[PDB]
Design an enzyme around this catalytic site. Structure first.
Site, mmCIF file in Angstrom:
data_model
loop_
_atom_site.group_PDB
_atom_site.id
_atom_site.type_symbol
_atom_site.label_atom_id
_atom_site.label_comp_id
_atom_site.label_asym_id
_atom_site.label_seq_id
_atom_site.Cartn_x
_atom_site.Cartn_y
_atom_site.Cartn_z
ATOM 1 N N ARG A 35 52.191 34.621 51.143
ATOM 2 C CA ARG A 35 53.564 35.459 51.737
ATOM 3 C C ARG A 35 52.639 36.803 52.473
ATOM 4 O O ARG A 35 53.497 37.521 52.987
ATOM 5 C CB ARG A 35 54.009 36.325 50.610
ATOM 6 C CG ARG A 35 55.688 36.197 50.620
ATOM 7 C CD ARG A 35 56.189 34.724 50.382
ATOM 8 N NE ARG A 35 56.197 34.496 49.012
ATOM 9 C CZ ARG A 35 57.140 35.006 48.152
ATOM 10 N NH1 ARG A 35 58.144 35.676 48.695
ATOM 11 N NH2 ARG A 35 57.133 34.882 46.915
ATOM 12 N N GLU A 47 35.689 37.115 45.247
ATOM 13 C CA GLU A 47 35.303 35.657 45.664
ATOM 14 C C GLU A 47 34.535 35.812 47.127
ATOM 15 O O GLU A 47 35.191 36.727 47.576
ATOM 16 C CB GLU A 47 36.421 34.637 45.613
ATOM 17 C CG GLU A 47 36.582 33.731 44.345
ATOM 18 C CD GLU A 47 34.983 33.134 44.186
ATOM 19 O OE1 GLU A 47 34.842 32.999 43.100
ATOM 20 O OE2 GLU A 47 34.401 32.506 45.341
ATOM 21 N N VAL A 90 42.354 45.476 44.338
ATOM 22 C CA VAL A 90 43.267 44.689 45.135
ATOM 23 C C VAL A 90 43.752 43.473 44.573
ATOM 24 O O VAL A 90 43.028 42.729 43.963
ATOM 25 C CB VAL A 90 42.369 44.307 46.427
ATOM 26 C CG1 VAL A 90 43.364 43.183 47.243
ATOM 27 C CG2 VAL A 90 41.752 45.497 47.070
ATOM 28 N N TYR A 97 36.751 38.026 52.417
ATOM 29 C CA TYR A 97 36.569 39.206 52.818
ATOM 30 C C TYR A 97 36.186 39.254 54.401
ATOM 31 O O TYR A 97 36.334 40.047 55.221
ATOM 32 C CB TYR A 97 35.996 40.344 51.901
ATOM 33 C CG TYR A 97 37.299 40.853 50.814
ATOM 34 C CD1 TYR A 97 38.246 41.372 51.284
ATOM 35 C CD2 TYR A 97 36.908 40.498 49.581
ATOM 36 C CE1 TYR A 97 39.133 41.895 50.782
ATOM 37 C CE2 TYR A 97 38.083 40.822 48.671
ATOM 38 C CZ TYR A 97 39.100 41.656 49.276
ATOM 39 O OH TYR A 97 40.381 41.986 48.460
ATOM 40 N N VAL A 141 47.409 40.512 44.393
ATOM 41 C CA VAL A 141 48.593 39.939 44.633
ATOM 42 C C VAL A 141 49.100 39.115 43.570
ATOM 43 O O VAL A 141 48.192 38.505 43.013
ATOM 44 C CB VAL A 141 48.641 39.022 45.984
ATOM 45 C CG1 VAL A 141 50.036 38.682 46.189
ATOM 46 C CG2 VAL A 141 48.378 39.900 47.101
ATOM 47 N N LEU A 176 48.370 40.692 51.046
ATOM 48 C CA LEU A 176 46.853 41.149 51.168
ATOM 49 C C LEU A 176 46.668 41.536 52.784
ATOM 50 O O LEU A 176 46.404 42.549 52.915
ATOM 51 C CB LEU A 176 45.875 39.776 50.893
ATOM 52 C CG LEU A 176 44.476 40.344 50.817
ATOM 53 C CD1 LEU A 176 43.956 41.187 49.915
ATOM 54 C CD2 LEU A 176 43.714 39.121 50.743
ATOM 55 N N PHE A 219 31.990 48.503 41.883
ATOM 56 C CA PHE A 219 33.308 49.245 41.881
ATOM 57 C C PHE A 219 34.620 48.449 42.107
ATOM 58 O O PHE A 219 35.687 48.818 42.237
ATOM 59 C CB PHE A 219 33.409 50.572 42.651
ATOM 60 C CG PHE A 219 32.989 50.311 44.052
ATOM 61 C CD1 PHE A 219 33.951 50.057 44.935
ATOM 62 C CD2 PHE A 219 31.782 50.353 44.595
ATOM 63 C CE1 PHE A 219 33.743 49.804 46.315
ATOM 64 C CE2 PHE A 219 31.405 50.082 45.945
ATOM 65 C CZ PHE A 219 32.481 49.747 46.754
#
Ligand SMILES: Nc1nc(SCC(=O)NCCN2CCCCC2)nc2sc3c(c12)CCC3
Ligand SMILES: Nc1nc(SCC(=O)NCCN2CCCCC2)nc2sc3c(c12)CCC3
Ligand SMILES: Nc1nc(SCC(=O)NCCN2CCCCC2)nc2sc3c(c12)CCC3
Ligand SMILES: Nc1nc(SCC(=O)NCCN2CCCCC2)nc2sc3c(c12)CCC3
Ligand code: NA
Ligand code: NA
Ligand code: NA
Ligand code: NA
Lengths: 396, 396, 396, 396
Positions: C88, C116, C79, C120, C81, C91, C396
């Protein structure tokens, strides 16, 4: 949550908030000295229902600006919000009230030392002086053939106890502060305070020593923890001879590896040495912050460079007025106008230009200062520059 | 101990002395690139009886000075004395011979990067540019309302592999170097060298990334040891929009705590932020050193401030000639005279004033620059100042 | 700024954004292995007009939960950006699309390792496992009289090269992952990857060694920089005898001062020693984060404590459904209801309770989990607790 | 080398051995306070022929255990052997005598804080509480939407001088200690001692400040050396509202970068934040150590989990008796038996289970706790667990 001038009963609550907000707070006894600089109605407190949760004050100061002009200055200080009352708009409320009282009292400028560099911009304060730490490894330091005081006819500098030569320090400082932009009048109570910090504290700071010349002094002490580092707290030199003579004496501290001093970017010390690199810049920070209270009064009060030829423009300060600005023969006339603005800037940007420490071109490049004429930018640049380099007097 | 131009047979001996004298020496393969900038008779070696114990050379460079004027410049480099032959006057002998060849070849100025700041003053080199390391804690960095590129209409900056956009970097650099004092022409072989350092080395430097704008680029890599620090090796911006856009992209490196860059004192980055203090100065050092070979040619070649009105003086350079100096309308005329000198300085001091990085008043205060007229000092000061801030192109 | 599944042409652009976004990124060759775990339609990219500015994917994983039940799990990864396209909503857009595809594909849970800990939570991920670094000063380490493997009848542990005993490591791991909550199936390509990191890298990591028991292994290497520290990368023990035997062998590394391992809070190593304090906790962090995609499927799939007696409640997940929850004989039935909720929580809080690593009472105390019955809190607490301590399989 | 109760004449010799054995020893004046907690016959000394070479004592304490039950507790302290008389069995002799006197006096449990974790296991002490240092980087700390005290109706927390609100601290602590396992009665003389450490020491500790809520307090001081770190010495909160309110106030210490506190593993502070990771665990250590003097009295005195159904077993403590143990409806009956043991453990292991800080399953895995029934292990596990998390009151 009401906003009031403190009474004598509020000050113990203010000292508590002080102790909890400022790590470097000596205590109430030393606060007596600084309190004498706070005018009647110079302080605001916020009570909750009751204890002090918010405070701010200004002191009556005298600030030298370019052209050796002294301005009455409101020195903001002792600004604190209780950790219990953050994000409640107490600062915005206290700073609005003090600025009202400062403006109504007829102060052309306000000044402060910023605890953090992210707060004071939006209250109209711009950083106006730059602190420059030089550390000299004095074991390699050799003076240049060109440096004054080469001939060993006899040293004009004496090693002395600060407390026994107060009169001489005062007289040198008074001469210094009147001829240097950023200079501040140091009243008697702050000399009392300075010379009491000069004595050794038990398991604290070591004894301070003085190097005394007819036209300069240095106060220095060995660092608490690093016993090979001497910290110059203060060096005031009125002539280049005094400045060189004091540095020859400091480089002669043969028990030290390093001499550090907080000075200004234009300190000539590096050019007194055969190796300019031996005087390393170890730290740089904003010194004094200015808020121009009255744009016309401030721009008219200071001197400008005689080198730039006469020129006229229209200056708009965001929410601060629009003015026909005419500069020539080192004077400015600044008068109301509704004519189209040629220069726009926020009030803080003006504070940053006022003592000549920042270039209009530099602020223009960041778009803090808008114009469509680059000729006018160069002229602004040259006019606002200071012949005498801007220094920082003392923290408040 | 004789002094000669090297033959092809001497270069393996020179590379050995190089490896032993310079820790940052890549090796002979990368030396091919730099060798192409050394003219015929650009190098001297000292042999003992035989091995190379001494070497020095100059490269053919093009240096932008104030007024967007490009001067042919002798770039001194690869200067080394064997540890076996110190304190034998080999440097003084090699530097005397090269300066002879540089002067006779018609170079108006010589330039170098100083390994130590105590050597080059007495050969007539003065520090002319200042390197300024800014470290940004980018976790707190918020751009100011006034900063260009606020509106999220779309980012004009692209993240790219350096090697795939060489053509664009070249074109931006070429534009940059022509409009900035301290600018140097970067020939093709040094672009080959730069983009080969851009790839990751096994147990060495990490991969370099590029941020590409139509009017600017940044090259950056994560530090070997500190994985939360990004080092900007190079940021070339032709417009203020490009400069802001590139910094918005670098502050967007959300995996980093810190962005460091070696820049110049007038970098506007601090004024793009709500908190000017977040861009700390972590390091300051002399960049490029200048030796004015021909005083009249150098003073006549550069542009002066249009703001200062026409004025005349007599400049004496110690063992460098005495000249009637007349400055007006941003041009200087510099002609022989035996009239009484109004300004005296060593040659190195002139090198330090030439690009506008140091103030005459600052050198005057250290007595590196003598005059009895303070009016003339202010006029010198304003005339030699550079509208465009002086930057440093690349180390050689 | 459109959102699409990548084609083979997009992957070079994705690897570029990877290199620029992740410091620990091996490269495209090792990416082949991980790519085999990404299903068709497992990846989204954002192009600008064109280059990749945004990417996200999930891998097909198998996660052991309490009761030795294996769930199909979408493992979010890769993941990123572009620093050019922050703030923007890229995500939020990519995570919305992948969660749609994950839910529609019939995955009951999604999982990730958080770069971080502040990102999430608002996408419904709660930290579910805890990483615990133990450092042993092995010079003082004496095993307790009570510890298994006291008698010197012969050591059942062998020192071996990892690559020569792959088959045995695989078999032990496969046994381990099936019986431990947080266990993940490790496919063949990740064993290929693991054993390639086991060999020494030039000016990188040192050679990895293995300690092999019939029912456990440890992989360890000496630290790059600290040559007296051995880092245990992986210790998988199926029996308490294997765990003690492997630790007796590691404490026998007489050339080391310190053994460090990333383990779980309930590692019994401290209780194997006469001085529990010798195994210091030097670091603690969230391991695996869970997002419960389907609340009824997830709660019904796992086993519960047989100790708590049968009980019924109504669970409301914020924007996630309201359910009649009935737990007894270590099973749960979870069915739609519009009856009044007895327990409210955000979806992330459920992810944190799901593997038994956090106590309902602890989340209740922070008001992340609301109820008006403290009896129901104790029952929730005991029911969701895991007999077998929750461990973390591999990043992972 | 004889063993005796000290007379008043022995105490100066004991204070000497104290000064030489304990770095953190205030002195004899503060020892007056602690001496009042030592009963008649609570102290033993060893004289040589004469000076004090050995000492040990216990204090009369009151310890809260699960079920809000308060036990009389012998608190071992001031244990020292002269460096001149090591490896002479003086500790074994003094600890044998005190344990005799403690047992004969009818104390069910003894407690201590361990200077080193390798000594006290073989005298029957097991670590029973866990100290957890959390450091918050409070510059990034944002409270969660779910956290109590979101609405800015007015802060219920006051910043105060500790000495002026003793009565309120006492009342809150007294409420706290009665409802928390590990709670200790703090008598008046230890409040006198605590509030005397609260004032600033010359070249020592800085002034302590208090945050006061109706149902909680925090005592905190800025660190001696690190002026951006605030150390919370003590935070006692009776309600979750008080705990959140006190943390909102501490995160509001805008002059600090970091807040550290020694707390317990189940502190909910991390769950009050949007980023759980901002509250890092920087240190973990054994707190209070327990020796169960009387197994039947201790097991019968504490409450058990109501969730586990009634069950019976036979517990053998090594050299401590064998007992028919029957647990149901949160009570235990513990009676002599010669029936076959189902659970064996050393006495120290029982001390570690007694307050619910360690799991039987964890000690079983290290073979500190033997059984052949894993059902009985789960039941033991659940029964001995504490609804209220175990905390540590104060060091003695
Ligand atoms: N203006 C005052 N200065 C000082 S000495 C410290 C200093 O030079 N700069 C840091 C200021 N900062 C720290 C400590 C005081 C508060 C803010 N002491 C005092 S006591 C007192 C004032 C004051 C203003 C009136 C009451
Ligand atoms: N002029 C040259 N530069 C470089 S790259 C290093 C640099 O940018 N500054 C430090 C220079 N210092 C270190 C290494 C070389 C010697 C002096 N490499 C080379 S090889 C080579 C030259 C050269 C001059 C011709 C032969
Ligand atoms: N899922 C993947 N893992 C890895 S190894 C690194 C690790 O274990 N954790 C940190 C993950 N983080 C850093 C590097 C990769 C991106 C995120 N390498 C790769 S390559 C690749 C994936 C992947 C997913 C498919 C393409
Ligand atoms: N029990 C006592 N505590 C204290 S304050 C220090 C502390 O909280 N823990 C470390 C204990 N350790 C260091 C200093 C004392 C000896 C052991 N001071 C004193 S003086 C004194 C006692 C005592 C017991 C009676 C005489
Ligand atoms: Na005009
Ligand atoms: Na003249
Ligand atoms: Na119900
Ligand atoms: Na039984």
């Amino acid at each position: 949550v009401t906003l009031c001038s403190p009474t004598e009963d509020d000050w113990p609550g203010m000292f508590l908030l002080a102790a909890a907000s400022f790590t470097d707070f000596i205590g109430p006894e030393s606060a007596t000295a600084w309190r004498t600089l706070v005018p009647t109605d110079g302080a605001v407190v916020v009570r909750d229902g009751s204890e002090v949760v918010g405070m701010a004050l200004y002191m009556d100061l005298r600030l030298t600006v370019p052209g050796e002009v002294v301005l009455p200055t409101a020195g903001l200080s002792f600004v604190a919000v209780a950790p219990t009352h953050r994000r409640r708009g107490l600062l915005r409320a206290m700073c609005a009230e003090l600025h009202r009282r400062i403006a109504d009292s007829g102060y052309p400028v306000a000044a402060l030392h910023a605890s953090e560099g992210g707060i004071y911009g939006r209250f109209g304060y711009g950083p106006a002086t730059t602190l420059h730490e030089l550390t000299v490894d004095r074991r390699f330091a050799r003076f240049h053939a060109d440096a004054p005081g080469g001939g060993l006819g006899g040293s004009s500098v004496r090693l002395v106890r600060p407390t026994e030569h107060r009169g001489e320090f005062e007289a040198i400082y008074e001469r210094w502060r009147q001829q240097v932009p950023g200079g501040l009048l140091r009243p008697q109570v702050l000399w009392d305070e300075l010379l009491a910090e000069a004595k050794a504290a038990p398991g604290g700071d070591r004894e301070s020593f003085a190097l005394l010349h007819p036209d300069g002094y240095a106060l220095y002490r060995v660092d608490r923890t690093d016993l090979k580092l001497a910290r110059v707290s203060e060096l005031r030199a009125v002539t280049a001879d005094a400045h060189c003579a004091l540095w020859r004496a400091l480089i002669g501290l043969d028990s030290m590896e390093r001499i550090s001093i907080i000075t200004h970017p234009q300190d000539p010390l590096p050019h007194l040495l055969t190796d300019t690199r031996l005087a390393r810049t170890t730290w740089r920070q904003d010194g004094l912050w200015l808020r121009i209270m009255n744009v016309p009064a401030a721009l008219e009060a200071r001197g400008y460079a005689h080198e730039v030829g006469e020129f006229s423009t229209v200056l708009e300060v965001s929410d601060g007025g629009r003015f026909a600005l005419k500069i020539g023969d080192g004077r400015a006339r600044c008068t109301p106008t509704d004519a189209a603005a040629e220069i726009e800037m926020d009030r803080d940007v003006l504070g940053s230009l006022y003592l000549g420490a920042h270039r209009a071109s530099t602020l223009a490049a960041a778009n803090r200062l808008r114009t469509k004429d680059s000729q006018l930018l160069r002229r602004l640049d040259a006019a606002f520059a200071s012949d005498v380099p801007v220094q920082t007097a003392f923290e408040f």
